[PDB]
Design an enzyme around this catalytic site. Sequence first.
Site, PDB file in Angstrom:
ATOM      1  N   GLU A  37       0.821  -1.217   0.000  1.00  0.00           N
ATOM      2  CA  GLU A  37       0.000   0.000   0.000  1.00  0.00           C
ATOM      3  C   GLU A  37       0.846   1.254   0.000  1.00  0.00           C
ATOM      4  O   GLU A  37       0.568   2.232  -0.730  1.00  0.00           O
ATOM      5  CB  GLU A  37      -0.931  -0.046   1.250  1.00  0.00           C
ATOM      6  CG  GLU A  37      -2.075  -1.045   1.052  1.00  0.00           C
ATOM      7  CD  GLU A  37      -3.085  -0.637   0.002  1.00  0.00           C
ATOM      8  OE1 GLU A  37      -3.617   0.506   0.047  1.00  0.00           O
ATOM      9  OE2 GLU A  37      -3.353  -1.443  -0.931  1.00  0.00           O
ATOM     10  N   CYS A 192     -13.147   3.096 -14.490  1.00  0.00           N
ATOM     11  CA  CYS A 192     -13.692   4.429 -14.182  1.00  0.00           C
ATOM     12  C   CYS A 192     -12.532   5.408 -14.061  1.00  0.00           C
ATOM     13  O   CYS A 192     -12.174   5.877 -12.975  1.00  0.00           O
ATOM     14  CB  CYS A 192     -14.519   4.359 -12.894  1.00  0.00           C
ATOM     15  SG  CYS A 192     -15.533   5.850 -12.603  1.00  0.00           S
ATOM     16  N   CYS A 199     -17.582   3.103 -19.417  1.00  0.00           N
ATOM     17  CA  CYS A 199     -18.824   2.716 -18.767  1.00  0.00           C
ATOM     18  C   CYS A 199     -19.398   1.414 -19.304  1.00  0.00           C
ATOM     19  O   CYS A 199     -20.050   0.658 -18.543  1.00  0.00           O
ATOM     20  CB  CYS A 199     -19.827   3.871 -18.875  1.00  0.00           C
ATOM     21  SG  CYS A 199     -19.295   5.456 -18.141  1.00  0.00           S
ATOM     22  N   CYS A 202     -18.397  -1.437 -17.212  1.00  0.00           N
ATOM     23  CA  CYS A 202     -18.490  -1.232 -15.750  1.00  0.00           C
ATOM     24  C   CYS A 202     -19.706  -1.923 -15.162  1.00  0.00           C
ATOM     25  O   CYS A 202     -20.831  -1.791 -15.662  1.00  0.00           O
ATOM     26  CB  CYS A 202     -18.536   0.282 -15.446  1.00  0.00           C
ATOM     27  SG  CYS A 202     -18.705   0.670 -13.661  1.00  0.00           S
ATOM     28  N   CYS A 208     -25.663   3.966 -12.298  1.00  0.00           N
ATOM     29  CA  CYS A 208     -24.793   5.131 -12.096  1.00  0.00           C
ATOM     30  C   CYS A 208     -25.398   6.445 -12.589  1.00  0.00           C
ATOM     31  O   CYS A 208     -25.840   6.561 -13.752  1.00  0.00           O
ATOM     32  CB  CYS A 208     -23.454   4.838 -12.804  1.00  0.00           C
ATOM     33  SG  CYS A 208     -22.286   6.241 -12.831  1.00  0.00           S
TER      34      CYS A 208
HETATM   35  S1  SF4 Z   1     -20.768   3.631 -15.124  1.00  0.00           S
HETATM   36 FE1  SF4 Z   1     -20.324   5.261 -13.540  1.00  0.00          FE
HETATM   37  S2  SF4 Z   1     -18.962   4.210 -12.015  1.00  0.00           S
HETATM   38 FE2  SF4 Z   1     -18.909   2.954 -13.963  1.00  0.00          FE
HETATM   39  S3  SF4 Z   1     -17.143   3.727 -15.247  1.00  0.00           S
HETATM   40 FE3  SF4 Z   1     -18.999   4.916 -15.911  1.00  0.00          FE
HETATM   41  S4  SF4 Z   1     -18.937   6.806 -14.582  1.00  0.00           S
HETATM   42 FE4  SF4 Z   1     -17.569   5.271 -13.554  1.00  0.00          FE
END
Ligand code: SF4
Length: 224
Positions: A37, A192, A199, A202, A208
């Site tokens: 870390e 992100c 997105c 994701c 989101c």
């Molecule tokens: S959906 Fe939302 S959390 Fe996911 S990469 Fe896109 S902006 Fe980031």
Amino acid sequence: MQASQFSAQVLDWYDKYGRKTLPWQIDKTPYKVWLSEVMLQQTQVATVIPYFERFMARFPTVTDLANAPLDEVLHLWTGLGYYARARNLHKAAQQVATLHGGKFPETFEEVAALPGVGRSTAGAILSLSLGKHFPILDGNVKRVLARCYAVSGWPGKKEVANKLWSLSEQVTPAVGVERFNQAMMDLGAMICTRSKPKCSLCPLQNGCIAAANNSWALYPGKKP
Ligand code: SF4
């Protein structure tokens, strides 16, 4: 998004795509997680891996690190930058050897009392190496949470930080905490991203708020 849905979608994503083969994740210990870390704080993973392996070979235990001369530690650190991190690393090893008999402490207050270790790094050590139920909040995590829940404002302001710490506590589960906390770092590092987030890759895209409004550039807020 409902917090229990957030946690389940992130864990399901991690199961299939998450990083599980970095050296600090094999045969994990509090010492290995703390060392990784601190090295990762201001340095990219590919640069850190050879330094992490050199430090574990020379210093197999925190007592070996504590007993070494500081100049040897600084020599091995050469190339990682931000050497206050290395000075604090050696002092924290000495505190563990002196106060805790050479065994890492297992309560939040004793770990946060180490030089160089703040609230998020303390939670990272205890959750990732021992399964204790703490959330994290580094820059990767701040970005995912602030975009999903549309948290504007600069996180350097106490009231914004408090809101993001409460959101992180809420979505971080107890069962699977080690998988979830690494998954959130993986998402912020690879999906992100600060510019043009991916997105479509994701697992939070269905709930989101930044994705629904194409407004990722607003979150987190910048310094005024
Ligand atoms: S959906 Fe939302 S959390 Fe996911 S990469 Fe896109 S902006 Fe980031």
